[PDB]
Amino acid sequence: DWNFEKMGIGGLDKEFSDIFRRAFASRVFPPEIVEQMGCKHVKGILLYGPPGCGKTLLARQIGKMLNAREPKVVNGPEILNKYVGESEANIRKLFADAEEEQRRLGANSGLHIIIFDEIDAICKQRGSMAGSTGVHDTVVNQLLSKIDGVEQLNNILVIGMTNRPDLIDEALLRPGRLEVKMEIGLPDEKGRLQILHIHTARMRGHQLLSADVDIKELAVETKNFSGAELEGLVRAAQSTAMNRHIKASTKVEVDMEKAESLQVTRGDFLASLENDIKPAFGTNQEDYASYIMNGIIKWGDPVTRVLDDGELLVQQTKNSDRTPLVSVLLEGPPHSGKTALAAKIAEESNFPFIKICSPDKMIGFSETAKCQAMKKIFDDAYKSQLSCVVVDDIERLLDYVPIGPRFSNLVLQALLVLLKKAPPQGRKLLIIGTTSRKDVLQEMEMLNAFSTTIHVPNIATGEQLLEALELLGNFKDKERTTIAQQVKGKKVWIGIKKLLMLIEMSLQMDPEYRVRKFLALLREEGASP
Amino acid sequence: DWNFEKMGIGGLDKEFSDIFRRAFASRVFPPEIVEQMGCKHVKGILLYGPPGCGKTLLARQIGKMLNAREPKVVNGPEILNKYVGESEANIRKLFADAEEEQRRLGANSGLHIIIFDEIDAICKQRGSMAGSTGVHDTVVNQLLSKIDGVEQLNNILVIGMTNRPDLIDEALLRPGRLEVKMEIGLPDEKGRLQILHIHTARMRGHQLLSADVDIKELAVETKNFSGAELEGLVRAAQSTAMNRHIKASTKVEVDMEKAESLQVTRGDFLASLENDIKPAFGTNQEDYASYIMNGIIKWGDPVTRVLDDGELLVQQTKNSDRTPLVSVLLEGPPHSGKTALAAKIAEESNFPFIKICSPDKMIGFSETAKCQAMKKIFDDAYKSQLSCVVVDDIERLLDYVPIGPRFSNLVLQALLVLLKKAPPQGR
Amino acid sequence: ENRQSIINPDWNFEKMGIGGLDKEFSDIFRRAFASRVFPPEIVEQMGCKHVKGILLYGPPGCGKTLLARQIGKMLNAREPKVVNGPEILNKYVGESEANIRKLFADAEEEQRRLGA
Amino acid sequence: MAEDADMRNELEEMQRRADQLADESLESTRRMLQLVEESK
Ligand SMILES: Nc1ncnc2c1ncn2[C@@H]1O[C@H](COP(=O)(O)OP(=O)(O)OP(=O)(O)O)[C@@H](O)[C@H]1O
Ligand SMILES: Nc1ncnc2c1ncn2[C@@H]1O[C@H](COP(=O)(O)OP(=O)(O)OP(=O)(O)O)[C@@H](O)[C@H]1O
Ligand SMILES: Nc1ncnc2c1ncn2[C@@H]1O[C@H](COP(=O)(O)OP(=O)(O)OP(=O)(O)O)[C@@H](O)[C@H]1O
Ligand SMILES: Nc1ncnc2c1ncn2[C@@H]1O[C@H](COP(=O)(O)OP(=O)(O)OP(=O)(O)O)[C@@H](O)[C@H]1O
Ligand SMILES: Nc1ncnc2c1ncn2[C@@H]1O[C@H](COP(=O)(O)OP(=O)(O)O)[C@@H](O)[C@H]1O
C-alpha cells in the first residue's frame, strides 16, 4: 500500500527518481532475466547538503517503504568504548544478522537496511604519516573489511548522511561500497509551493484556514527559504491564531464561547514574516536600514546617470551567457556618498542572495582570519542561481597607511585571485567595489581585474547647493534668499555628508545667528581639485 | 496555584509574554483542535545578555511553573571525562526517561525538562580543526543527533543560558531545535520601580519601613543599575539599619530597648547609595579626582572658550536624529593642560555613562591586547541610551617614535575603524 | 530553638591574637555579619539573604590567612577547607573541574538531610 | 597548551568465589542427622 503522495516530500522529484532507478530497479524486475544478466546489487547511498533541507526525512521515508525488517540506527558516535578491542565489537554486531540468513536461506533472503548518522564523526581519513589516534584507524579498517570482504553479502543496504563530504575516507566511496552520492539543496518557486501545500492540506481539510489566504503570494515572497523555515512560519502563524483566545493575566483560562470560531488569517502570516522567522541564505531589511541611513535625494543629474549605469550592468549579468562574471568599481573623493549608492544598486537588483562584506566585523583580526572570512562569504555565494556581493572600503581591507607604505600582501593576493574565478557551471555573479584612492589601487595592478569604472562627483555649483537645501527643507524663504545672494556668484566644492553635518552644526545657535554661522562654516570648507 | 504576581519577576513583561505565546500556547488549548491541525511543539529556548539581569531566575521560575516532574540540570561542563567514549555516555543518559515514556504511553506523556547552563562551554562551532577535533566534535554531533533524529520525540523542552551568543554552533539554532532567542537587558525607569516594589514588600507589611522613604525618588537616582545591584542596595540599607542597634565592641551584645523600635530611614538609603554599591555601567567620582588634580583656575579668555564649544558639542548629540555619532579633537603645545579640560567637559555633561581609556593601564601589553581592551570598552558603550568615551594621548597608544618612523599599524586600523561605526538603532 | 547562638559563648577582639587592624574589622563586621547575630525573628520578618563571600588583597606577609581563620572560628563554623590556586590544575580533560566540584559536596549533602 | 588526547584501559580479572558446594554438604549432613535420629 505504498504511494508517493503518502510519503510527504516536496521539491525532490529528480533526486528520488535517480535513487529509485539506481538502487531499487534490480529488485523488482522478474528474477529470471536479472539472473541471465548476471549483475549484483548496489549497497550504498550518501546524502550531503546544508542544514535543514530534507535528509533525515528521506532516509526515514525510505525506511518505511520497504517490506523488510526494522532498520537499525546509529546516532553518531554510539559505537565507542574505553576498553581495548570493544569499539570494533559493536561494528561486527550490526552485520551479524545478515551473515546468518545468507548461509541458510541462500538467495531468497530479504533486505537488511542499516542507517548510519553523522557519519563524518567516526569515518575520517586515515593518515600515512603515522599520526593515527585509535578512536579511528581501527574502526575504519573493520568497517571497510566488513562492507566488502573475502566473503560476499548480497542482502544489505547502507545509508549515510553528512554535512561535510570532504573529510570522509576515499577508500570508502569507490563504486563498490557507497556508489550513489546525492546533494540535497534549496528549492525554487515550485518546490516552495509544493511544500506549502503539503504543510497546509490538513488545516484546509477541516475548514480551519481562512478564505483570503493565498499560497502563491507566500511562495513568491519567500526567497531562498529552506525546507524547515516554511514549517516554522506556518507553526508561528498557528501559534498566534491560537493564543488570540488565551488569557494569562491572573490564571490561564480558555474562552470556550469564541474558541469554536478559530480561523487563521493572513495578518498572522504577515506578522510572523516580519517578527519571527529570519532566513540564512536570504536578506533582511536591517542592512539597508543601517547603510542607507537618510535615504537618497536627487540633488542633480549625475545621480540618475550612476543609477542607470548600475541598471545596465545588472541587466547584462542577468541575460548574458558568455560572461557569467562581471565586476565594477565606484570611486571618487571622500565624503561624497559612494557606499549608499552601491547598496541601492544592489537592492534594486531583485536578486535572491545579497551580501555586504564590510570591515566593521573584522576589528582586531589577523590577515589569516580576514582571508578565511572572505573565502566563506564567496563560498556561500556560490550556491545560488543569481547573486550579488559588495566589497566595501577596499583601502581599509588591505591595512593601508601612506607612511612606508605598509599593507597586507596575503590579503591583496586573495582578492586578485577571487575576482577572476568563474562560479560552477550555469550560475551568475556580480561584484561591486567602492574605494576613495584610485591611484594607489592602480599602482598595485588592481584595475586590470575590474571590468569598468563609475565616477561619483561632489556638489559643484550654487544651484545644486540650493536645490539640496530645498530638498532637505531646513532653511526657509528669507534665509534661502540670503544664502542665494551670498553664494550664487561663486563656486562650491563639498560632499553631501559634510553638508548634513554642517547643517546640523549650524542649527544650534540662537534663531538670529544661524545663517551667519552656516556661511562662516562653509567658507572654511572650501577647496579645489 | 500559579499566578504571575507571585513569580517574583519585574521589568520583563514583553519577554515572558512572547515566550508564553510561542512555547506554551499549544500545550493548553484543548487537545481536539490541536490534533485537528497536526503541529509539533517548540523544543528549545535561548537566553543571553550581560551579567546579572535575570536569566537563571527566569529559568528557575519556569521550571516550577509547569506540572511536569522535577527538571534535570547540568552545572556547566560537568559531562566531560578523560576516558575515550565517556562524555557521549553522559550526554545520552539525559534523554532516556523521555524515550522510555514516549515508547510506552504514547501521546499522553507529561513534559520532561532539561536545563543546560553556561552552554558555550561545551557547544562550540565544529570544523575549527587544530583547535578541537576530539571530545568537542563528538560531544556536539551526539547532541545534534539526539535532539532531532530518526526517532521522533514530542515531550521534551530544553533551555540554555549564555553570555556569549556568538560562539555557539549554527546547526543548533534552526527551526526544529533551540529556536526562541530572547535578550535580557538593562531596565528603564518602570523596571527599576517594579523591582524596588518587589524587593521591599515584606518589610512594608510588618511596619518595619519608615514612612519617609519614597520609592519614586529612588528610581530616578539609580540610572543604569541592574537588578542584582538594586537588591544589593536594599540589603546594604537593611544591614546599616540593623547594626545601628548592636552597641558592643569587645563581646557581642544586643540592646533590647530600641530593638523593638527598629526602622529603616532615608538616611540609610542615602548612606549606602553613595558608599557601598558601585554600578558597572555608570559614572565614577574617583576619576575626576585623579585627573583634575588641582582644579581649573580661569587665567583669561582662552579658558572660557573651550568649555563653551564643549557645551555646544554636548547639546548637539542629545537633540538630533541625523547625527547620532559625534567626535572632536583637542590639540596644542605640550604641558598646556589638555587632559584636565577633556575630563571637565565629560564631567559637566550629565550623561549616565562616562569612561576614560588611558594608556597607563596598558604597560607592557602587545598590539592584540590593546585592540581587545579598546574594543571591550566600546562594546560596553553600546548598551546605554547615552555615552561619552574619552581617548587621551593617542601617540602613546600608537607607540610613535620619530626615529624610523616606527609605530603599531593594527591599533591604528582598529582606531580608524571604530571612529565611524554607528551604535544600534536609537542610541 | 533560636539560632542566635552562632556567636561563640565568649569572644573578645584584641584577645584573638590580631593587632593592627581596627577599621577593617569594624567595616567587615558591620557590612557582612550583622545579620548572623540578630535574633532570628526580626531577620526572618525582614526576609534578607546573607553575604556569600569576601575578597582580601594586599602585600604578602601582612596576616590575611590569620584573619580568615579567626573569622571562621568566630561563627562556630566547621573546619575550613584550605586550598591552593596552582594545586588544582591538571593536564587531562575533566580533572580540574572535578577538583573544583569536590569542595561543595558536604554542603549540598547537609542541605539535603537537614533543610534550613 | 597541549591537551592529552584521552586514555585507554586494560583489564585483569580475578578468581570468583562460588561457595555453593558447602550448601549441598550442609543439606546432606542434615539428612545424616535425621536418619541417625530415627535409627535409635
Ligand atoms: N522537502 C520537504 N518537504 C517537507 N518538509 C521538509 C522538507 N525538507 C525539510 N522538511 C522539514 O524538515 C524537518 C526536519 O528536517 P531534516 O530532518 O531533513 O533536517 P536535516 O537538514 O537533514 O538536518 P540537520 O541540518 O540538523 O543535520 C522535517 O520535519 C520537515 O518538517
Ligand atoms: N544623493 C545621495 N547620495 C549619497 N548619499 C546620500 C544622498 N542623499 C543623502 N545621502 C546620505 O548621505 C550619507 C552618505 O555617506 P556614505 O556612508 O555614503 O559615505 P562615504 O562616501 O562612504 O564616505 P567615507 O569617505 O567616510 O567612506 C548617507 O547617510 C546617505 O544616506
Ligand atoms: N528582573 C529581576 N527581578 C527581580 N529580581 C531580580 C531581577 N534580576 C535580578 N534579580 C535578583 O538578582 C539576582 C541575580 O541573579 P541571576 O541568577 O538573575 O543572575 P544572572 O543574570 O544569571 O548572572 P550571571 O549570568 O552574570 O552569572 C536574582 O537572583 C534576583 O535575586
Ligand atoms: N586652567 C587650567 N587648565 C588646565 N589644567 C589646569 C588649569 N589650572 C590648573 N591646571 C592643572 O594643571 C594640570 C594640567 O596638566 P595635564 O595633566 O592636562 O597635562 P598634559 O597637557 O596632558 O601634559 P603632557 O602633554 O606633558 O602629557 C592639572 O593638574 C590641572 O589640574
Ligand atoms: N596583625 C598581625 N598581628 C600579629 N601577628 C601577625 C599579624 N599579621 C601577621 N602576623 C604574623 O604573620 C604570620 C602569618 O602570616 P600569613 O598569614 O602567612 O601572611 P599571608 O596571609 O600574607 O601569607 C603569623 O605567624 C603571625 O604571627
Numbering used by the authors:
A (entry chain C): 212 to 740
B (entry chain B): 212 to 638
C (entry chain A): 203 to 318
D (entry chain I): 1 to 40
Pull verbatim passages from the article behind this deposition.
To gain insight into the structural nature of binary complex formation and disassembly by NSF, we prepared a complex of NSF, ɑ-SNAP, and the binary t-SNARE complex (21bin20S) composed of full-length soluble SNAP-25 and soluble syntaxin-1a (1–267) in the absence of divalent cation (i.e., non-hydrolyzing conditions) and performed single-particle cryo-EM. Classes with evidence of NSF D1 domains engaging ordered ɑ-SNAP—SNARE sub-complexes were carried forward; eight 21bin20S models were built into reconstructions ranging from 3.39–4.01 Å in resolution, differing mainly in the orientation of N domains and a sub-complex of three ɑ-SNAP molecules and four SNARE motifs relative to the D1 ATPase ring. All classes revealed substrate-bound NSF without Mg2+ needed for ATP hydrolysis and disassembly, and share the same overall architecture, with a spire composed of NSF N-domains and the ɑ-SNAP—SNARE subcomplex on top, the NSF D1 ring in the middle tier, and the NSF D2 ring forming the bottom tier. A Hexameric NSF engages the ɑ-SNAP—2:1 binary SNARE subcomplex via multiple N-domains (salmon), which engage three ɑ-SNAP molecules (gold) surrounding the 2:1 binary SNARE complex composed of two syntaxin H3 domains (dark red) and the SN1 and SN2 SNARE domains of a single SNAP-25 molecule (green). A linker N-terminal to one of the syntaxin H3 domains is found within the catalytic D1 ring of NSF (light blue). Of the eight 21bin20S classes with the 2:1 binary SNARE complex from the dataset collected under non-hydrolyzing conditions, six engage syntaxin and two engage SNAP-25 within the pore of the D1 ring. Docking the 2:1 binary complex structure back into the seven individual 21bin20S reconstructions reveals an apparent preference for syntaxin, with six of eight reconstructions featuring the N-terminus of syntaxin H3 bound within the pore of the D1 ring. Taken together, we observe that the NSF D1 ring can bind to at least two different SNAREs, syntaxin, and SNAP-25, in various configurations. Otherwise, the classes are nearly identical; protomers B–E D1 domains also bind ATP, while protomer A, at the bottom of the D1 split, is ADP-bound in both cases.
The membrane-anchored SNARE (soluble N-ethylmaleimide-sensitive factor acceptor protein receptor) proteins provide the energy to drive membrane fusion in various cellular contexts, such as intracellular trafficking and exocytosis. Supercomplexes of NSF, α-SNAP, and either a syntaxin tetramer or one of two binary complexes of syntaxin—SNAP-25 reveal atomic details of SNARE processing and show how sequential ATP hydrolysis drives disassembly. NSF comprises three structured domains connected by flexible linkers—the adapter N-domain followed by the D1 and D2 AAA+ domains. Six NSF protomers come together to form the active form of the enzyme, a homo-hexamer.
